[PDB]
Amino acid sequence: GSHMSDNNTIFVQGLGEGVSTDQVGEFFKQIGIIKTNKKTGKPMINLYTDKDTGKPKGEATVSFDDPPSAKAAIDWFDGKEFHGNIIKVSFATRRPE
C-alpha cells in the first residue's frame, strides 16, 4: 500500500454497455463520502464513452477523500462484476493536466 502521491483518483473499468447514469458516484458513496477534488474544484463524476463508434468505452474515474481507502476498495469492493460486466478498480494516473 503506502503513500502514492497527493493525487486522489481511482480508475474504474467495465462501466459501459448497459450502464446507468451519473448514479455510479452514488455506487461509490455506499462505501465513503463524495469528495470535491481540489484540482478543478468539481465533485467526482468522470464518464468516458466514445460516441464516435456509438458504443460506450466502459471507462470512468471518481475521486475519493482518503488515499488508503482507494487501495482497500481494490481489495474488497472490486473482484466482482457491475451489471454482469467485469469491473476493475485502480489508482489511475497521477498529475492532472
Swiss-Prot record:
Positions carrying N6-acetyllysine: K42
Phosphoserine modified-residue sites: S5
Subcellular location: Nucleus; Cytoplasm
Cross-link (Glycyl lysine isopeptide (Lys-Gly) (interchain with G-Cter in SUMO2)): K39, K42
Tissue specificity comment: Ubiquitous. Observed in all fetal and adult tissues.
Domain RRM: 8-94
Modification(s) after translation: The methylation may favor nuclear localization and positive regulation of TAF15 transcriptional activity.
Disorder named in the UniProt entry: A chromosomal aberration involving TAF15/TAF2N is found in a form of extraskeletal myxoid chondrosarcomas (EMC). Translocation t(9;17)(q22;q11) with NR4A3.
Family: Belongs to the RRM TET family.
Its biological purpose: RNA and ssDNA-binding protein that may play specific roles during transcription initiation at distinct promoters. Binds to ssRNA containing the consensus sequence 5'-AGGUAA-3'. Can enter the preinitiation complex together with the RNA polymerase II (Pol II).
Assembly mode: Belongs to the RNA polymerase II (Pol II) transcriptional multiprotein complex, together with the TATA-binding protein (TBP) and other TBP-associated factors (TAF(II)s). Binds SF1.
Official protein name in the record: TATA-binding protein-associated factor 2N
Organism: Homo sapiens
Shown segment, full-protein numbering: 231 to 323 of 592
